[PDB]
Design a protein around this ligand. Structure first.
Ligand code: NAG
Ligand code: NAG
Lengths: 196, 596, 597, 195
């Protein structure tokens, strides 16, 4: 009986870019979620389809921890039935979502003098993402009838853009680290359980 | 697919690249201003040049999306702003000549030195010495030496440059299908529609004219008063019926008459309200000034400053460890990064300035979420107006009394109020015909109505006819006296300062109405009028994402500019001035001159 | 005994001996104006000569009674007007030359005529035909031909005469101990003292100059409005920022913009407050116009016109081939003899005129009880203002409705309001910068501020700058356009027509408030008031026996000239004009002209 | 016992100047005053102490008719307790005057083209006249400390001046013919009686 590897998720030195969001599948363990709920180091902690005080009483067949970075103003899009650049083309949550969305301000790690442009996002896509879908294509977006063979201009744009995170950014633009815990509450043997 | 669909995508990309670049530039530039070094000027000019090349490129590409095809107003507006600028129109060679002219006029102005006539070793700059002489001197001949000296050593150097400047600037303007460079500068007030009911660029000229003539009673009475008081101190040189000589007006051009207050104060025994002493007594530092100002905005239901505002602004002269630009500014760098750079001293002037500047920032914040191109005041007059309005409420005697800066034992009789209104009138009413006249000269000069051989001839004729001001020495066409002013020689439009003033009082009167202010408009204080706050935030948040006619109508319930509120603000000074001028002439004779 | 006792007897004698002399001079001057001939000129000259001789001898004898020991103000005043007179001022040669210059100028003006270029057999005088053209014509070239023809055929003649006239009048003025002829003219408002604070002659310049600026916005808006409407009837001849052509303003000079009303009426679909046509259709004659004016004055408590007024006035141009002076004048001949001389056409203008002239008569009747020397308005402006004050209430559409003239249903609202205030504004506002600029140009010429060599030049500069009216053709110094107006070539001061305007509205506002008028100044009609009439007659009775400032204070509770009332009277029109000009330019560019674009 | 001679007083062809006003004494007679009352040609007919219709029943010892010419404005001074040039210095009626004053507009007879200057009045006097007193002296009026002995000059004026009557004169200035009848109440028998 050993504990879930949530430490690797939450305490990771760097997170992935939202467009290519990182997911860890959590199985066959026991974890204490009271640590997460009582953390008091999270700016955002909102749960859907489940109660946080009570997921210490619950057992789940699978748990998915997704982690990525977005701006503060964008955290609101990590919720069911939302629209925006992130929700439409980067990370989409289903309407019948069961899980929690946790976020905290990441300015001290992910902002640097002169700007941190390590983190990318997707700005254009031909249709919205389906829930839990990941698109890492680096295909020139073709907004005109004229075919784009590459490069840019003439109504053809490179789909990925880089965030620039500075210490002098306004709070809405500062980096935020998001972990989305999904509980795959459907069926099979449940092996991911909470102790007390 | 649809041309508007492709336009939205182009603007999406543009706004996203523009945000990063703009911020980079603003950041480099801010470092320079708060840390003058050669290294930092390198960074600022590099940031500015990547930003410039990006804006040129984007502007060229914008011309690919026809405006007719666009239906949405923000898309179309953005496209318009991106299309009518940035893209090249002059040859490489002629671009470079115009830039070298612009930078040569700036540096000729910034470095001009005027030497004492019989003592060539001692010379003066505009920045300290000349500014000081023109502000403080009562020596007619000293002022005359400074005024003429500045116009002859700087002006005459600017004249050839200014001529070639008018030609190249006109050539670019017309390249953009504006009729001259003045018409270009007037596009700021242009608005599209409702049904062809849009504000047109000629309508600005019509309005500025109508206002000019509706202000004639107040100005000519004020002028009258100032003329007779000047006679007491300049006995031989002031004709009871002539224009006021240009060099006796309180600064190097007569743009404000503020510094004439000691010469023309209505009642000299009443004490002026200066709480500088009172602030020092209470141990106040700059931080206290800005916290009080913030309290004023929160008190009307506006937000407090951001934490970034307090860590990042330069509120005091920086610990005297670095060289810095002390001229007060309010910076909207981007990305929620709001700052104030100002060398705050614990003075009343600096106290007021703080509110002016936090007004600018409050405006910045309200519209922070609009698209990049629309993060601006409804037109050029709006931003500065908002600042001025704030300073009005805050500077009233009641505000200082409730604050503790002014004794409750202070007595607000009719005399005190007249002294205050006259100081206001010097500053505010003085600058209107000056500003009208200057921009009118430049509009006319751009359009070709004033040919080179008569530039100065008409300048002085206009100074005498519209401003009631006469040059002390005659000037031939080797001079370029317009250009001896900062804004003229640095390619800044100037009429904003006119519209600003008009708007300020339209704002003020409305907001005080809403704040259920009972009494004289000049003694109004919108503090704790959250209702006014709400109507003000309404106006601020829209940016220039809407025809300014519409936003202006939302605040003051009027669609067009009005001097009504300004006239009405000053009406007690008016009726007073009328009794005072009962035994004086009012108006001027344009023929009389000191030298004739 | 007391020096003042003796002065009162002196002046007693002076009144009784002066009565028949003045009377015979008025009587003969009158015969000359109703029947002009050389013989009647001789009679006017000898009669006037006895008036002058007697006056001299009395004026000298008045200096025996020194002002210092006179206690009473009306006595001291009479002695003042006698003492500061005399006639031995100009050499006899120079007097004969001045009078001949005056005569020449007058008869040139009244006989000058311009022929058509394509029929030099067919000319016109000013007093009928050229007046008609300039007052009704809507063709540019026609108005140009008449405007220029008058200034070229008659002005150019008056130039050398006028130049000499100035020098001589100025000499006479300097002899009387005045700065110049203009100063001497301005003496009319001067008042002696009280605390040492009296009206001085320079003051009139100051107040006139102050009111001029205070009137600038209203005038300029009126001007912008008239400019845009004129663009419609003279399409390619008006600049939307230029000055207004002088020959297009509704009369020979643009003295009054009244006749522009059909070209500028705001709401022409509404009836007509120019009641000319209605007057004609109803069978009005001269006698009707004057009987009706009389009725109005009676209604406020004032007397009927005297029996002799009806008996021996000339109210129409005769049909017996006598030639006359059609210029309207009200006469106080003396001995209770009051008369009016005008050639009355059935128009609303002459209807109003008839009230104005009857107002002159009513002022004369009321100060008839004053000493001879004190029988005069408080100043020229006062005397000019009274009749007009009456015609304000008469002009009102409400008043018009009550006496036929407008159909009884009518229905007033804000459009008919605007129509009426626009008509008034043409007449009253349009004339202020004109009157001002004319008299200022005269005053400065008299002061030597303008030399001969710049006379027309300066004149047109001031027309451009102050009036906003530009000459259609360039005029060099052989012209004398100031003199082509009757008052300038007939040697009358002209500032009376400006101050009058101001005073008129102060009077109107005082009287309307005594009438307890509930509402806007411009709806007020003081008919049937009586308290109004009594207050006004209390003013009129004083004559000049008392400083025009003091008697002004007794009516409007102020001592000073004030356009506040004129401004409030027009304020409805003003805000309306403000809206109408939102898409016009307001004000003018003195560099544009119709001979150089 | 035949009727009074009032016609020669009223219908006389020439009237006197006020300064030298004319008096006719009416005695030993009987009169019909109804002709006077029924004239309808009089501008003024004011009776004091008696009624014109009562005069037909009344008997008087004597009647005095005083006649002269003055201006219309001056007629108001022909009454008890009045002051003015006429009343002060020419014709003065006593406070206890009992009689009638009749006047009528005389312009057709006493005004002429070019003016009629037949008629004179007194403008200055050392003191006001007593009732029914007449001063026809032509003595130079001494208004100053300096005696004028001889003649005219500064501060001495000749007392009598002439009216000038023109057809165009105003009504107040037109000539008026005045007759003043005084009825005295003597101690003796009445000799002047009505119908
Ligand atoms: C999920 C997880 O391991 N965390 C967290 O416990 C610890 O207190 C912190 C500091 O070391 O990291
Ligand atoms: C005067 O004569 C007229 C006409 O003969 C006559 O009517 C009138 O009665 C006469 N008066 C007297 C008093 O006889």
């Amino acid at each position: 009986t050993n504990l879930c590897p949530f430490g690797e998720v939450f305490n990771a030195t760097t997170f992935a870019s939202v467009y290519a969001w990182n997911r860890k599948r959590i199985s066959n363990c026991v974890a204490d979620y009271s640590v997460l709920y009582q953390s008091t180091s999270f700016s955002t902690f909102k749960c859907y389809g489940v109660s946080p005080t009570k997921l210490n009483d619950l057992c789940f067949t699978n748990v998915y921890a997704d982690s990525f970075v977005i701006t503060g103003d964008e955290v609101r899009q990590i919720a069911p039935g939302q629209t925006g650049k992130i929700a439409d083309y980067n990370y989409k949550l289903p309407d019948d979502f069961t899980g929690c969305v946790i976020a905290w301000n990441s300015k001290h790690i992910d902002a640097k003098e002169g700007g941190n442009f390590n983190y990318l996002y997707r700005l254009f896509r031909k249709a919205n993402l389906k829930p839990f879908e990941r698109d890492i294509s680096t295909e020139i977006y073709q907004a005109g009838s004229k075919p784009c063979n590459g490069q840019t201009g003439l109504n053809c744009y490179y789909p990925l853009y880089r965030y620039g995170f500075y210490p002098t950014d306004g709070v809405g633009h500062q980096p935020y680290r998001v972990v989305v815990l999904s509980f795959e509450l459907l069926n099979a043997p449940a092996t991911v359980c909470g102790h007390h | 697919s649809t041309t508007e669909d492709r336009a939205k995508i182009f603007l999406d990309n543009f706004n996203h690249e523009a945000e990063d670049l703009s911020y980079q530039s603003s950041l480099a530039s801010w470092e320079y201003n708060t840390n003058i070094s050669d290294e930092n000027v390198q960074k600022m000019d590099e940031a500015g040049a990547k930003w410039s090349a990006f804006y040129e490129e984007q502007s060229k590409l914008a011309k690919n999306y026809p405006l007719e095809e666009i239906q949405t107003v923000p898309v179309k507006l953005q496209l318009q702003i991106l299309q009518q600028s940035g893209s090249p129109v002059l040859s490489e060679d002629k671009s470079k000549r115009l830039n070298s002219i612009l930078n040569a006029m700036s540096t000729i102005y910034s470095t001009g030195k005027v030497c004492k006539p019989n003592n060539p070793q001692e010379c003066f700059l505009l920045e300290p010495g000349l500014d000081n002489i023109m502000g403080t001197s009562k020596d007619y001949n000293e002022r005359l030496w400074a005024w003429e000296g500045w116009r002859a050593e700087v002006g005459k150097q600017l004249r050839p440059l200014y001529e070639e400047y008018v030609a190249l600037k006109n050539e670019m303007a017309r390249g953009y299908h504006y009729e001259d460079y003045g018409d270009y500068w007037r596009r700021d007030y242009e608005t599209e529609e409702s049904s062809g009911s849009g504000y047109s660029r000629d309508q600005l000229m019509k309005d500025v004219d109508r206002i000019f003539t509706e202000i004639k009673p107040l100005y000519e009475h004020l002028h009258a008063y100032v003329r007779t008081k000047l006679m007491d101190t300049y006995p031989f040189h002031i004709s009871p019926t002539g224009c006021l000589p240009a060099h006796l007006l309180g600064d190097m051009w007569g743009r404000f008459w503020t510094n004439l207050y000691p010469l023309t104060v209505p009642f000299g025994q009443k004490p002026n309200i200066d709480v500088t002493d009172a602030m020092v007594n209470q141990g106040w530092d700059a931080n206290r000034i800005f916290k009080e100002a913030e309290k004023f905005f929160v008190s009307v239901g506006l937000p407090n400053m951001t934490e970034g505002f307090w860590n990042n602004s330069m509120l005091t002269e920086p610990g005297d460890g670095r060289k810095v630009v002390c001229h007060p500014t309010a910076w909207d760098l981007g990305k929620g990064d709001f700052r104030i750079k100002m060398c705050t001293k614990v003075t009343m002037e600096d106290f007021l300035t703080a509110h002016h500047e936090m007004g600018h920032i409050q405006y910045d914040m309200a519209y922070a979420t609009q698209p990049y191109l629309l993060r601006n005041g409804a037109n050029e007059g709006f931003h500065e107006a908002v600042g001025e309005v704030m300073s009005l409420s805050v500077a009233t005697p009641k505000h200082l009394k409730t604050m503790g800066l002014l004794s409750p034992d202070f007595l607000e009789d009719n005399e005190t109020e007249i002294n205050f209104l006259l100081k206001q009138a010097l500053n505010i009413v003085g600058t209107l015909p000056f500003t009208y006249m200057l921009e009118k000269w430049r509009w006319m000069v751009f359009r070709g109505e004033i040919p080179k051989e008569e530039w100065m001839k008409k300048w002085w004729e206009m100074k005498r006819d519209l401003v009631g001001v006469v040059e002390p020495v005659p000037h031939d066409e080797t001079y370029c006296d317009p250009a001896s002013l900062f804004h003229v020689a640095n390619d800044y439009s100037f009429i904003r300062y006119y519209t600003r003033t008009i708007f300020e009082f339209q704002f003020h009167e409305a907001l005080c109405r809403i704040a259920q202010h009972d009494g004289p408009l000049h003694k109004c204080d919108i503090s704790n009028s959250t209702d006014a706050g709400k109507k003000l935030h309404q106006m601020l948040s829209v940016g220039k994402s809407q025809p300014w006619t519409v936003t202006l109508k939302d605040i003051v319930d009027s669609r067009n500019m009005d001097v009504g509120p300004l006239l009405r603000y000053f009406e007690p000074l008016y009726t007073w001035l009328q009794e005072q001028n009962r035994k004086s002439y009012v108006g001027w004779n344009t023929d009389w001159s000191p030298y004739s």
